[model samples]
Target: SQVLKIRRPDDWHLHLRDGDMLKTVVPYTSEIYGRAIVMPNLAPPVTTVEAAVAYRQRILDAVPAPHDFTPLMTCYLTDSLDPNELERGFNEGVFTAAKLYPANASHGVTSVDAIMPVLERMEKIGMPLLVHGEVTHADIDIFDREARFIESVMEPLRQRLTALKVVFEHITTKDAADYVRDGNERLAATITPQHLMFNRNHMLVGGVRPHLYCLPILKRNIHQQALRELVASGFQRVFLGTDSAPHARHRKESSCGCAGCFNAPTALGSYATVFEEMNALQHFEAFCSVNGPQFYGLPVNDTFIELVREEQQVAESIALTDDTLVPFLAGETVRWSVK
Candidate 1:
């Protein structure tokens, strides 16, 4: 087919950092995606309901052309996370879910043990926990963190809180794909376009490619193949997350660079390329649009977007307030474009 149409997808996971960075990137996602589960890992981190609401408003204000975009805010979980604040956020419609970033991991919570009470309350209230799945101990190999987290942290948490809903955000390993596939309906995962398109070799084979770097860092080709097969297998729990994090051009190219892929500008087209290659266009809509809303008990979008089978050049660097931000697939041509 020359053109494909589907309900506008929601980014099950996203990170539109604050201030100028937020303004610079929000439009790239907002114009295409109908809603996004905004990550709370900002400078101070969005840990409270009032903070989330204010952040949501900033996102709303920044959205270009008053598009029908919605930002689904999340609370950053901590060891002393208050059950009452969490309940208030969920009940008051201020937060759609809570995020658990291991203290050693990247952003938020320290130990699952320290936050058991909060997790229990979330289970009772039916709020989903979006996790950055990786064990960040100093000893584990970076590539091995996701798998280790599955065995050490995730499985134990799931066993204790069977009723709690969870989204294994930005899954990069075969272990994560298999674990979510084997788990009950309460479990699901969000796959990124970068992971689906490139493996660790793409980043390190020639020389370190900073832009391809992200937390739950890229894995081996075998793991990449496993993720491809899982998505191609039409796994219902797997959906799009993007994890489209942006860092200043300088911050990323430095000796100590940040971990993230700013794929928002080309996210949809990239995902289309993967599904088309897998010949799983039949399942693309469900993976991108249906599964996420159903898992969250929200209604699927009534709007739609069309992707044409035409080549388009992805911009090398996007203009930000002070510096340029590079995007994934920069300067490369993809065989798809939004219509």
Candidate 2:
């Protein structure tokens, strides 16, 4: 009951932000995992083969020596990018997949319809598409966006692009879970530790806990229950994607704080707690390790991570070059840790 060993895992959705922060955050993921799907929403976004390769090199540079972790690069989706540019990068092994953020997005398919050809290339080649899964507009309620997106955007798109492998990234809410569960084999979803562990009530009840405030903001607990049920039932398509974003404490405690949680340091332990409480520990290994790579047609990691079931007090905050980062679940003692 005190210890366990499992196949090494990967962060299917992650962000080790640019420049100085890369050195600080990259190792936090690399230390315990075998590989990661790096997010590409840099300041201008990583949109081309040339830009993708340059950022890929920077990630490797940040990984201090002897830590065997791989950064699988993904490009950002823009309305006007050439389809062949993505094709060239994928064929050359520079771009692993691409991510879509419907930021300030309108009521219907403006950018998506424009990029139909780009998506066609990905579907034809079996390349994956990662999405932020919300339709951001001024009208829709912030809490209702995830489910609404599935009905409005996702439904029609999936029907049209039957072969496109869509990862409904960082899923929250019962509607999202049910959509994935009922979806065909080609459709899969990624669950974040924050979404799995806590809901909006956890953040809303207290003096606002900004670290827990993230996009696809925690849904109602009833919705949270559905996500737990999907994972506990050993749903094959659901996998681990920490969506581990790190921004300085000063940035987070703002009058209008940005979205994302600096979650890399605490992700694995937080996930373990979920599986343990669900009494579904047997399904834990695949959720963390096998399911993600299989969905992408990549090889499973042969290495192992020995995790200890011990009381560990998490750091209050991690120091950065300019400011400190408040990690998710900071200052709390978690039940699982890697040693």
Cα lDDT of candidate 1 equals 0.91
Give the per-residue lDDT of model 2 (tens digit) for 224-265.
Answer: 999999999999999999999887998899998878998899
TM-score of each: 0.98, 0.97
Error of 1 at 187 (Å): 0.6
Model 1 weakest lDDT span, ten residues long: 102-111
- Per residue, candidate 1 scores C-alpha lDDT tens digits across 18-47 of 999999999999999999999999878888
Q: In model 2, how large is the Cα lDDT of residue 279? A: 96
True-structure Cα RMSD, model 1: 1.1
lDDT, model 2? 0.89
* Best model per lDDT: 1
Compute the lDDT of residue 317 as modeled in candidate 2: 89
